[PDB]
């Protein structure tokens, strides 16, 4: 089965189990693409989200997201929305989203269940025109249908993209989590500005708090430990030139210089000067084996990642929660299974945060909030296992928010269609190390606060 056909038969595994989640997920995919279109490219995100109930009896909603990002070259638009790829591309740059189909899952669901086309308007940086489309995915042929295509004259300095998708939804069911999704995005994106207008006509405004944008992720070449047979054939098939196996190793991968390639070639039983387009199955097998076994690669480069940053984590926590204290940490990068990863953690304490018997726990993966399935997440487990009395929290009731961000070019999820990060040992170890680091900052704060109260009580009239 193709991913498109696997989606159609198993949409509950892809974040579309029912209309309430479809509505939520569509909003997510559009917001995530709008952010990747803006901040990855040095642009402060100015994003408008509207949701309208367009057919009351059938509970059809139109979701419209508008951004100021870099736009889509018109020639790429039909395949971007209307052609599901036959396999996921190897990830070489950090991007927002759990789901391989991205917006294409919203488009499929739209075309499966109702009759309006998708509406797209886009203007690439410096374009003299805005390109407009009404589009469908052919649900049988997995190909775009262009219903309407046109353009209008652009205005000074305008660039970006508008997408509207009509779909079955359930606003009353989805409402609180859509709001929470947006809030939690805003917390770690205080340089974005959002406007959200809901189906009931409520308007929420999330103003820009800063103009500081974190360093973007950069494309890297794949790390040898991350690739299997199929991925190597893909790399071979994609070559524009007639590289030798040696040239292939040195130029298509991370961490293979001249000497390393030589050693790899020797261990693999390959001729350096054989043309790599001629690699046989047996030869690929030995190469992959040699890759898995080789002990002398540098770690996967973290150049492909982008953190939120301690400064922004703290600013977001403080502005949203108005706590008495906030702290954060951005850890040094680690790696696993051929991909780099970074953990960040944050804590906000006291002030306007509600009293509870447990912390408010915020989970992020590649800068997207995880919303469902929180009790099965490795992040939830770590926070729950930590003994807060060791870090200065004395009462059974307290006001605390804890956040953890994992970013990687390969986030491990427990189950398709669930929003929980898997309990991978090396990732759990690092999340725990991060949390402890921030918790020590909190312990210091509480110890200083307590000494100060004691001093006033005992020494001041
Ligand atoms: C090509 C550009 C910039 C890329 O960074 C964006 C990441 C993913 C985008 C995938 C798309 O299919 C086009 C797109 C969509 Cl669907 C959207 O909802 C909002 C957008 O702003 C863009 C866009 O302009 O995409
Ligand atoms: Mg995405």
Swiss-Prot record:
Keywords on record: ATP-binding, DNA-binding, Isomerase, Nucleotide-binding, Topoisomerase
PANTHER family linked: DNA TOPOISOMERASE 6 SUBUNIT B
EC number in record: 5.6.2.2
GO terms for cellular component: DNA topoisomerase type II (double strand cut, ATP-hydrolyzing) complex
Activity under varying temperature: Optimum temperature is 70-80 degrees Celsius.
GO terms, molecular function: ATP binding; DNA binding; DNA topoisomerase type II (double strand cut, ATP-hydrolyzing) activity; identical protein binding
Coiled-coil residues: none
Family stated for the protein in its record: Belongs to the TOP6B family.
Binding residues for ATP: 33, 67, 87-89, 98-104, 418
GO-annotated biological processes: DNA topological change
Description of how the protein assembles with itself and partners: Homodimer. Heterotetramer of two Top6A and two Top6B chains.
InterPro entries, A to Z: TopoVI_B, TopoVI_B_transducer
The name this protein goes by in its record: Type 2 DNA topoisomerase 6 subunit B
Function: Relaxes both positive and negative supercoils and exhibits a strong decatenase and unknotting activity; it cannot introduce DNA supercoils. ATP is absolutely required for DNA cleavage; the nonhydrolyzable analog AMP-PNP generates nicked or linear products from a supercoiled dsDNA substrate. Generates staggered two-nucleotide long 5' overhangs. The enzyme is covalently attached transiently to the 5'-ends of the cleaved strands.
Catalytic activity, reaction form: ATP-dependent breakage, passage and rejoining of double-stranded DNA
NCBIfam families on file: PRK04184.1, top6b
Organism expressing this protein natively: Saccharolobus shibatae (strain ATCC 51178 / DSM 5389 / JCM 8931 / NBRC 15437 / B12)
Regulation of activity: Not inhibited by the DNA gyrase inhibitor novobiocin, instead inhibited by eukaryotic topoisomerase inhibitors such as m- and o-amsacrine, ellipticine, and the quinolone CP-115,953. Radicicol inhibits the ATPase activity.
Encoding gene per record: top6B
